[PDB]
Design a protein around this ligand. Structure first.
Ligand SMILES: Nc1ncnc2c1ncn2[C@@H]1O[C@H](COP(=O)(O)OP(=O)(O)O)[C@@H](O)[C@H]1O
Ligand SMILES: [Mg+2]
Length: 306
C-alpha cells in the first residue's frame, strides 16, 4: 500500500497578464511544500488559503529539479517491474504540456517524457547480464474516442487475467532515445486543450522476466465527460465509477490500484483565475488521500505483439 503523491507547479506571471492589470495571487513556500492563494475579491480580515503537498515548484523551479526529486524514483520503480503513472492536471495555459514534454527540446528545458527516455536508456546501457525490451505507445482520448496517434478509433476491452486493454494499439519497439524520441515526434505531428494525451512506455526485462508500464498523461484543461468522471472517481476514493469514462477505465490501476501514481497539479499565478486555481488545489488536495497497492509484475514467456 502507498499514497498517491501530489505536487504543485506554478508557471511565472506573464508580461501580458501584468499589462492587463492582473496581480499575482499564488505564492509558494518551497521548503514546506506549500501553496497559498489570495482571493482578489476577498473581504477585509480574510486570510488566504494554504494547501500542503509533498513538494511544490514555483516560477524559478527548473525542469531537472522536478524530474530528479519527484519523478526519477517513480521511473526507477518502473525499471524494477512496477507500473507507474504521471499525470498533469490544470487549467489551460498553466503548463501541463511544458511539464510533460517540454516546449523546448534542449536537455535543460525538456519535460518529464524526454527525461524519462534519457533515464531509461542510460540505465539499460549501464545494465549487465540483463536484457530490456522497451516499447512505446501514444494515444489520445477526445470526446471519449480513443485515437491512436501512431497509426484511428480504438475500442476498450476488459479481459479477466490480463485486465483492461486497447484493441489494435500500435506499439513500436525502441532501441534508442533517438528511436523513442521519433515516436513521440510522429505522435505530436498527428495531434489539444480539450483532448487527453497518453504516452505509454513498457519495459520488459529478462535476467526471470519483469514488466513495468509507465503512463505519461497530459489531461484536457480543467477549464468534457472524462474530467468529470475523474472528478467523481477521486471523490469516491478520497462504489468507484471507473466505467463512467474511457479515461477512468484506463487509469483504473493508477487510481486505487496496482500502480505508483504522481499527480502534477499545474497552476497560474494570476488574479484572473482564482476560481480555476482553487478548483485545482482542492482537487489536488483530495487526490493526496488516495491509497494505491503497487505490486511487482511477472511477465509471460509469450509476449508476442505487433
Ligand atoms: N514553468 C514554466 N516556465 C517557463 N514557461 C512556462 C512554464 N510553464 C508553462 N510555460 C509556458 O507557458 C505556456 C503554457 O504552457 P503549456 O504547457 O502549453 O500549458 P497547458 O499545456 O497546460 O495548456 C507555454 O508557452 C509554455 O512554454
Ligand atoms: Mg497543453
Amino acid at each position: 500500500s502507498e499514497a498517491l503523491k501530489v505536487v504543485a507547479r506554478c508557471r511565472p506571471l506573464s508580461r501580458k497578464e501584468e499589462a492587463a492589470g492582473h496581480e499575482q495571487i499564488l505564492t509558494m513556500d518551497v521548503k514546506l511544500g506549500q501553496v497559498t492563494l489570495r482571493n482578489p475579491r476577498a473581504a477585509p480580515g480574510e486570510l488566504p488559503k494554504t494547501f500542503t503537498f509533498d513538494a511544490v515548484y514555483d516560477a524559478s523551479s527548473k525542469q531537472a529539479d522536478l524530474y530528479d526529486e519527484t519523478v526519477r524514483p517513480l521511473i526507477d520503480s518502473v525499471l524494477q517491474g512496477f507500473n507507474g503513472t504521471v499525470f498533469a492536471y490544470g487549467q489551460t495555459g498553466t503548463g501541463k504540456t511544458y511539464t510533460m514534454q517540454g516546449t523546448w527540446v534542449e536537455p535543460e528545458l525538456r519535460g518529464v517524457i524526454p527525461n524519462a527516455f534519457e533515464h531509461i536508456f542510460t540505465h539499460i546501457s549501464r545494465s549487465q547480464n540483463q536484457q530490456y525490451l522497451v516499447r512505446a505507445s501514444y494515444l489520445e482520448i477526445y470526446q471519449e474516442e480513443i485515437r491512436d496517434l501512431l497509426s484511428k478509433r480504438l475500442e476498450l476491452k476488459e479481459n479477466p487475467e490480463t485486465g483492461v486493454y486497447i484493441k489494435d494499439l500500435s506499439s513500436f519497439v525502441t532501441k534508442n532515445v533517438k528511436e523513442i524520441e521519433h515516436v513521440m515526434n510522429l505522435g505530436n505531428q498527428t495531434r489539444s486543450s480539450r483532448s487527453h494525451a497518453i504516452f505509454i512506455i513498457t519495459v520488459e526485462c529478462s535476467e526471470h522476466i519483469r514488466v513495468g508500464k509507465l503512463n505519461l498523461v497530459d489531461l484536457a484543461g480543467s477549464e468534457n465527460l472524462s474530467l468529470s468522471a475523474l472528478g467523481n472517481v477521486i471523490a469516491a476514493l478520497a462504489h468507484i465509477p471507473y466505467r463512467d469514462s474511457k479515461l477512468t477505465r484506463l487509469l483504473q490501476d493508477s487510481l486505487g490500484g496496482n500502480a505508483k501514481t504522481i499527480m502534477v497539479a499545474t497552476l497560474g499565478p494570476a488574479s484572473h483565475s482564482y476560481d480555476e486555481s482553487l478548483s485545482t488545489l482542492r482537487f489536488a488536495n483530495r487526490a493526496k488521500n488516495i491509497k494505491n497497492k503497487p505490486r511487482v509484475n511477472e511477465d509471460p514467456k509469450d509476449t508476442l505483439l505487433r
